[PDB]
């Protein structure tokens, strides 16, 4: 395949120290590690809400196939908001293995999220902090994780939004959560060029230390 050729080259280029035989990289969303209200399509890169959006907890999350290996040093993925759907209650972030998936990322312990309706970051609590702008249909949201200093920043349409989280646990999974019908988002785990210039960021950071 040509899609997979470009993916392999980009992973090799961004994460030269990672041997995927030892630590496979996340390349798509997991069909097994998701809540029932999540549907996957487009080689498991596209996420859509498929629950009836009228229950006490409609929130539904999905984790990528693998956790981020430390040997990345710095890890990056981007999520494109194809459709904000009804209310655009969409969260992008990270979560540990086994975290409850009837939630948006960040509501629970060992779960971290940036939510589009309010621009708020969620760090193991149901109450957010003001962090960034809202985001909606058309926007690209990136999540950059530093495995060395255990911090994370997000990006919007190519622009850093500053550090959102510190004291991140290891072995976090890229995670997306949706809540209302019509919400659709796409992961780029490296299948495509990133909107954010992650290579330049990685260069600047390795010089800074």
């Amino acid at each position: 395949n040509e899609q997979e050729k470009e993916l392999q080259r980009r992973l090799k280029r961004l994460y030269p120290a990672v041997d995927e035989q030892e630590t496979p990289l996340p390349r798509s969303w997991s069909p097994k590690d998701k809540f029932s209200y999540i549907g996957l399509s487009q080689n498991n890169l596209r996420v859509h809400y498929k629950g009836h959006g009228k229950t006490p907890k409609d929130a539904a999350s999905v984790r990528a196939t693998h956790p981020i290996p430390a040997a990345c040093g710095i890890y990056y993925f981007e999520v494109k908001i194809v459709s904000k759907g009804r209310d655009g209650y969409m969260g992008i972030g990270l979560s540990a293995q086994g975290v409850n998936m009837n939630r948006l990322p960040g509501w629970d312990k060992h779960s971290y999220g940036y939510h589009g309706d309010d621009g708020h970051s969620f760090c193991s609590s149901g109450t957010g902090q003001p962090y960034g702008p809202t985001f909606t249909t058309g926007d690209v949201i990136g999540c950059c994780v530093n495995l060395i200093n255990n911090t994370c920043f997000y990006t919007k349409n190519g622009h850093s939004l500053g550090i959102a989280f510190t004291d991140l646990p290891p072995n976090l999974y890229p995670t997306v959560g949706l809540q209302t019908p019509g919400e659709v988002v796409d992961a780029n785990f490296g299948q495509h060029p990133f909107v954010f210039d992650i290579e330049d960021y990685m260069r600047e950071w390795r010089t800074k230390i």
Binding site: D87, R103, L104, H115, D117, D118, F122, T127
Partner: peptide, 6 residues
Amino acid sequence: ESSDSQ
């Protein structure tokens, strides 16, 4: 909402 609880 994005809050765990209305």
